Design a binder for this molecule. Structure first.
Ligand SMILES: Cc1c(C(=O)C2=C(O)CCCC2=O)ccc2c1c(=O)n(CCCc1ccccc1)c(=O)n2C
Ligand SMILES: Cc1c(C(=O)C2=C(O)CCCC2=O)ccc2c1c(=O)n(CCCc1ccccc1)c(=O)n2C
Ligand SMILES: [Co+2]
Ligand SMILES: [Co+2]
Lengths: 380, 380
């Protein structure tokens, strides 16, 4: 049952913005590790005396990396006279965010038909304002409201290239890397209490709960066409193994974005390319499941994957689960930075063709039981 | 005239420590861009609840990357009970340093015979204490005094593997990258006033001035065997082109480390390997000199370099200058991070063999005039 109760019209995920200490070094690491191209910049070379912001792209996926300059560079400025290309940026907010949480996602940005209306409707329906709507160069409107912890849901709307004031990067600096990642599938938050978080967000968006003992309870909020998916996790305290959600909240200093799930058009090639680079500047992956997990894969997905495609999953460490509607291939990186907080999931879905409907195959929660069983069975 | 007036005994450069927001992402970028191996770590996996520190090595060059965790992780700790592996670390000092300067060098570490004595003698001779001597595991002594701005000269001494509490990285995580960089040749500071900076540092070290209109005045302080070299720059105000030193001080919020010069055993291979990676996560280089610069190279270094070796300099953008004692090959990267502050120089020296004596060939100040002339001559 999808009641299609969105209180405004939302199209798709637009971009994810990381707040960093040095946007240059994070963006270069991410670009090599994930195969994303340098697409746009807004910094001193473009006249921005406030923040440095570098955009990476792969397919429709857009990662923005932003860090503050010395406030002394822009001391004569006031908001009306700002050189910032993102008007919601604030030196003090960014330094406090990064000091408190370390490297992580500040904004989950979705594209809307009209950012002003979406902001107005949101706050009228309980959203806590963060940045009022601002129209940039009579071309793009952006607005922000609180999502959970210190993360904002950013609304972006275009009348008719990323943002005004950003410049497209010179080809010489822009090497056409691509490992097959194509778009953002879902973005997941960790909170101390799931219930109030769900009521708050679903309260101001109209998003509905998407149809779905290992450290968490979870639920998924979705847009009308279920292309925007926002799962939220809480910890289950009192187990024997400590909750990974609780560990997150402790090292993150509270609620925040846990993982970004990036859809690949060819997960086998994406994982081959990322695993080649794991020890030369890229991203590490979580430990692989035992061969027991893959021997048991034939009995569950042997209808969808060949034996050659299943052993290819085994050499790459890919996990597989299944809904009644589709099949899911997934794998998780190790944490993206110093703290055991944010990580990335690489994903590709098969089935539910009509295009492919969103969430086809679920989110892989059945892989918790399958991994534990496979692990214990492997031991004995 | 080398009066050999060192007030204690110093061996060589030991390591350079960067203070970062996220030590993981800076270290991975540097490792790929410069060809340095992950050699040691001190972080949560080693029991350090205070800071994350990752060591990269190439030859005798050691780069340390350190960032603070949430103070909440170590709130019950006091200095006697600390889990920090570097006892001079302080959450507040590091966050304030990085907020003020951005990514840059906190410590220039030199190896001494006895760090306690070197600290005592230094402060008795005018040095401003920063961190008193501390003996780690009855094995290593470290101490720190102020050098310029917020950079410290760190003394390290070993009775008889980087530091106690650091672990050697698992081979699987440690990919044997190497582009030919072998050691730190010199480390350069930018200050507002050269005179007082020189008197202060030479005052407490006993270092002597090493034998030597484009934006700076400079002078070089050296150890007894002239293996430790510490040039210092000041701006020359009132030119037509603005001083790069003054631009540094403005964006850095005052005095600090301008560049690190890394000696290569094969600069041609180092530059080939680094230039291959410039647009895929590595380091960019300053613009190359015009062909005019290289046509004029034959008349000045045609005795030392073949025509094949000279055109190889031309394809890599390498600069060449000469003392009366030796010849210098050098090239400069673009800034290492967001701000136009710190950069890196790659260097290789030829001549003055006895081993090679330090500073053989100078520091390339004659390349300021040669580049300008070559540039103007190229135009017309
Ligand atoms: C995150 C995830 C998902 C996932 O994507 C997902 C959502 O999209 C929405 C609904 C809830 C949810 O969980 C699916 C399966 C997963 C994991 C996962 O993290 N781990 C590793 C667990 C060890 C661990 C150690 C340390 C820190 C974190 C974790 C798994 O083993 N499985 C099977
Ligand atoms: C730094 C250097 C050295 C050098 O190493 C050195 C020392 O070791 C010690 C003594 C003084 C000194 O200068 C030598 C030659 C150099 C440069 C250099 O920076 N530039 C680029 C200038 C444009 C520029 C733009 C923006 C920001 C900075 C600079 C050059 O053109 N030349 C020829
Ligand atoms: Co997921
Ligand atoms: Co130099």
């Amino acid at each position: 049952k999808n009641p299609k109760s969105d209180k405004f019209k939302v199209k798709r995920f637009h971009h994810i913005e990381f707040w960093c200490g040095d946007a240059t070094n994070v963006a270069r690491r991410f670009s090599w590790g994930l195969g994303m191209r340098f697409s746009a910049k807004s910094d001193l070379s473009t006249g921005n005396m406030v923040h440095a912001s570098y955009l990476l792209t792969s397919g429709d996926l857009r990662f923005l990396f932003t860090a503050p300059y010395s406030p002394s560079l822009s001391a004569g400025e006031i908001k009306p006279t700002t050189t910032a290309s993102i008007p919601s940026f604030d030196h003090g907010s960014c330094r406090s965010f990064f000091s408190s949480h370390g490297l992580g996602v500040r904004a989950v940005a979705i594209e809307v038909e009209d950012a002003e209306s979406a902001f107005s409707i949101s706050v009228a329906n309980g959203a806590i304002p963060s940045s009022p709507p601002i129209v940039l160069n009579e071309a793009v409107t952006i607005a922000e409201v609180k999502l959970y912890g210190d993360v904002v849901l950013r609304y972006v709307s275009y009348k008719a290239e990323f943002l005004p004031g950003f410049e497209r990067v010179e080809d010489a600096s822009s090497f056409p890397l691509d490992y097959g990642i194509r778009r953002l599938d879902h973005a997941v938050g960790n909170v101390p209490e799931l219930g109030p978080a769900l009521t708050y967000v679903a309260g101001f968006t109209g998003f509905h709960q998407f149809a779905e003992e290992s450290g968490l309870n979870s639920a998924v909020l979705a847009s009308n066409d279920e292309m925007v998916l926002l799962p939220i996790n809480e910890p289950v305290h009192g187990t024997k193994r400590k909750s990974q959600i609780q560990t997150y909240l402790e090292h993150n200093e509270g609620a925040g974005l846990q993982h970004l799930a990036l859809m690949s058009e060819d997960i086998f090639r994406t994982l081959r390319e990322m695993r080649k680079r794991s020890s030369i500047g890229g991203f590490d992956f979580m430990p692989s499941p035992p061969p027991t997990y893959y021997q048991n894969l034939k009995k569950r997905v042997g209808d969808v994957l060949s034996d050659d495609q299943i052993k290819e999953c085994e050499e790459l460490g890919i996990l597989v689960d299944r809904d009644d509607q589709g099949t899911l291939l997934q794998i998780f990186t190790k944490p993206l930075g110093d703290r055991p907080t944010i990580f990335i999931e690489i994903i590709q879905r098969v089935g539910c063709m009509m295009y492919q409907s969103g969430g086809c195959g679920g989110f892989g929660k059945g892989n918790f039981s399958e991994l534990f069983k496979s692990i214990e069975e492997y031991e004995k």
